[PDB]
């Protein structure tokens, strides 16, 4: 019967609502804020106002990292350890890192052969350098192989970034660290061959058992500047401490025996009865959560069942915490978990017929939905056609414009008015006013009454069938 | 006929807005802005610009007990602090904090040992109550709440009792000082505070409005600072003008008024149609009367219990406790507030005199229960837009740290008040995703079928009026 | 019939519009605004970083009269066209009851500004006229309508010196014998300059309200004024415009008059008549406006040359004020006339058919919606008008409201102020405005639409 499926699903949503509900517990935002604010927001000295998130030139970077880097890593209380707030301890030893290119990896015309000597090229596995350069006294100057470094890719804003590069490890103390900085300064360190930089550490804070890995990122690009970034992710991977977790434990083995059942179940209604079974819409959305519920089980027993680096680390605290996969699949299981819960919310549609005014609301929403497909095609190919016209333009002043995505985010907030007119007036003086009156009007006067016309157009046609009838 | 109902509300709304009126003085705005600005704006010292509202350490929080804080709070002309050569200072500030005890959490073994102390959250179960220190004095000995005269706060962060250790301060500048520096010196915001109270009151004599302030500072488990201020205006010697007995009869009228029509609802109820409530203005009334009884009970209990105030008299030389007075008040601003917007919404009842407003009134109250299953439909979309987007911005954006954040974002979205220079560096993938089919969504499906269902519901009404 | 009034109307569009443009670009708001940063901008003095728009004390105030106002008075480089006056309003000592609770330790009480409690008595040293008071008659004023009350034109008044090193020992004295008591309720800085490098004369008002709650509170204008002369050709050219305006309104109200009087039994019905009477009345009133402030502008040159006397000089400002204001709504309603040409077409005859035809359901409705929206402003302002100056007055909660509306919202202060009562006024307000009243006015439209074309089909 229907009452069976209902309080079935309200049985799933009650065990989801209490695990997403237990994964976000007191306020780790304020964790995360506080950091980020000591890392990011801090001038990198005194008498200049500039900042990790304002930065403009090499030195700027230099500056950063004798400055505000060393100020935040190392606090005062033989060899004692570091604790950021009185109450995060600081894990092992920072790691620094750098990706630079080969000299003569371009291709410079005859013509010019006299003026122009050096020449580096973009970043590519291709074009990295693997030579030792400059004092070859160290792991600093010496290429070390991604293997040989247990790292990954990376992903950042203008390139993917492999995991290898030239690396060095820093102290426990900030006067050894700041030592090793000044050699590597003192010895050209950053060439302008170099393209990219990554500093990694990891905290703690023992008072709620939660990790927290800290990377920070600078890109150079070959045509000059320089770009930041970062990535601040709290982790848990001691779990078993509390009667909480336990209860949580617990959640996660019903949510599992839940997806095995409507697994089952799903293919008893798939084996024989009603083979096509796909013109439903609901059918499609059961398998679409029991796929994504499938594939954060599978991310989950893999990320919880190797954490042979926390022991590594464990067996010795002087080294370096390797901690960047587990952030990167917490962040992956986040996404899928985060779309599950979506899904399963909006699955509740199934069973809101109480009476006749929803049937009747549902049946205009399915009547409809065939002529609003027909309509979005053609509102998306227009809307497509406007944002290729952006990015041609304007794509290069802007930067509001800058990348195809960013150009349909754009107009997305146009619609909503959080736009700056001024900014695309000035770079076009013609063409430009042109294209935000001929949108705004196209898009207020026309586009958005059609939907209006055939929503209630359905809606009448429905409401007076069924009065008739 | 119709008419006496009608008068009869007229004068209701005719007192009503009187009371409201006399309640509301006007420019009471500007003595708290100006207490505000004097306390939370100014700079700690003359060195850093760093105010109450932008605190980040414990040593900063040190700078503003000693700084800015004894600069606004004692003025000169034992006598007597004037805090614009207006407001007296009524007795003495005191100075409260909590904190939890060692141990109140257990370090996992793999890092026990290296890490020796933690400390829990701040919670009831969790609190210290031992003595620390030099155990001299009242600042080192843990008080009871009950013995305290205190009550919960509902801060920020959790919500935390009347306990903890306190101190009264002293009536001028070179004893508060003296006694700030010495709970500096033997430490007393250690590793186990938790939050830290700062309260006074004003008169202004000038007119007759009291005003209590207090300030609030939290020390979270993660490390830093978070403030957070109080300062409510009141009235306790209420009877000293003309226009003050104006208004005690006007609350006597009101009174009077609330008894006939609660008599009058309950004559209407007990035999006369039974199970009366299929009318939507009846379920209106027994909710005003409802409220209005409320409210005249709060006001009759917070007006009586002034022993507070009556009990400072006659020694001016300790704190004055005015926070049961000011929450209360607040209470029954929200009340009278609530109790106000629906006796205005009432007016509908009678605006019936021609045809136009009659059939606006009817195509208004036939699409009632469309409007209401389709809000259903919209706010379970809006629900599952705003978990999702709880799980993934609920860290890093500071609009979606909470649900209700989550919430209050998404309707502010709508009026194009958000960034998304933070959604998209939050999460490059599922960040703009979210942001564009939320805003297709809304803008070109949902608003078009409220749209299509009022026009329908209008212009069949309208027809099968005209046509019967 | 209707060609010679198509035509005679185009030709009024295109002068007034011609008119229009030529007060388009006067270019007076980028002096004013860069005189007004020269005040209100610049620090107080070389340590303090406040400026006028941000003073909050007496001391701050005394140190502007004596630094940023003397120093950006007499040196772009304008000239003074006399001296200028600071007047003070005050009240009286014991011009309220202290309860008798606690009135061992509180001896004197101020109540806030009214006539009823206002001071005359002399104080301080008895000298001059900055020590005694002086009707409202003497100093040929007017109330001012002020942030948090009105004030008359009396008061104690004091007119400074064109020397700098005579004002400045003037101001001294004044601060040395307290001028500024605990009764000091307003303060009022008034004088003019001329700029001589771009000839616009221009008038300016500075005032400082003290509550009696503690500090201060700054409010200022500056309005400017020209003194029109035939110079030129092209002012010439705007003359013979103005001519041809007052030609042009002559020639409507004669006729109006003569439409009147032929159909005085029913004048009403047709709206395009007050429309029309609406702007032949505007027209009138904004060129008498005009005519006086040119018969009057005669006699602020007096002053030019070398006067120790103060011109007074705040009339001429509110009015130009109040032209400004009617010359707007009267571009606007002659915009607005041009409605009743476009009509030609059989669509444009049904456009105007359903427009007329439902603008008694849309009155009907506009009660229904002012009725909830008052509602809600009254529930703003009694939970927010303590707290958050965007709803201290009923008004500022009206215009909130309707900036609310049009998408202005800040919700932080919102927020702040009250954590419950307010997210939910803020949430219910959007969700019943923006997704149900609104839309009920588009309803009523449409439907009509469709009455309008059925009813061809049965024709
Ligand atoms: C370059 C570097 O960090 N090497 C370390 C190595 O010492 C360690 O034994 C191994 C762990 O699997 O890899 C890592
Ligand atoms: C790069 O290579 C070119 C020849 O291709 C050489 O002239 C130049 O000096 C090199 N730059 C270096 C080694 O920095
Ligand atoms: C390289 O190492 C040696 C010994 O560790 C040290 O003396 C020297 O300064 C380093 N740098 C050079 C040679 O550039
Ligand atoms: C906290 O308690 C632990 C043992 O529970 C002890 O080793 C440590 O010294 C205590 N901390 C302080 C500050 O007394
Ligand atoms: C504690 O005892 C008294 C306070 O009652 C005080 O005189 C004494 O100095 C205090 N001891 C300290 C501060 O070490
Ligand atoms: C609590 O109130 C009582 C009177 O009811 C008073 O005697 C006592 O001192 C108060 N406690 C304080 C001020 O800590
Ligand atoms: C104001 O009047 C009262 C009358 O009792 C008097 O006591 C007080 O001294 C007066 N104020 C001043 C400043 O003299
Ligand atoms: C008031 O008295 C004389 C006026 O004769 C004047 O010169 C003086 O400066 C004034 N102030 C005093 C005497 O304090
Ligand atoms: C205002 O004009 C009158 C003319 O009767 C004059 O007596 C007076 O001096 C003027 N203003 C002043 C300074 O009082
Ligand atoms: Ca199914
Ligand atoms: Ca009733």
Known sequence: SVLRELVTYLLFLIVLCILTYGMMSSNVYYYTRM???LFLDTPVSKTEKTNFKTLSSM???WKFTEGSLLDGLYWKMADNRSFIFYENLLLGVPRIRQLRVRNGSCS?????????????????????????????????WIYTSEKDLNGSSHWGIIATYSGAGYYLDLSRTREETAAQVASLKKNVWLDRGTRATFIDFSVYNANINLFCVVRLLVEFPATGGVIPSWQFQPLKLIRYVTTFDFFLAACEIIFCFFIFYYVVEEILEIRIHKLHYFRSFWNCLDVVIVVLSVVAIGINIYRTSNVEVLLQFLEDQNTFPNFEHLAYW?????????????????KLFKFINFNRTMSQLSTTMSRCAKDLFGFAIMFFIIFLAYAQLAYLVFGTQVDDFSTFQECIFTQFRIILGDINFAEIEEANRVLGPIYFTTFVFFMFFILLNMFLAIIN???SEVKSDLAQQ
Do not use: H
């Open 35 to 37: 950091m980020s604010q």
């Open 59 to 61: 030195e700027d970077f």
């Open 108 to 140: 410079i015309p005859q013509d010019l052969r006299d003026e122009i000597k050096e020449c580096y090229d973009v970043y590519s596995v291709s074009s990295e350098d693997r030579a030792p350069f400059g004092p070859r006294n160290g792991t600093a």
């Open 330 to 346: 917490q962040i992956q299981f986040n996404n899928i978990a985060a779309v599950t819960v979506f899904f399963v919310w909006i």
């Open 457 to 459: 157009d359905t809606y």
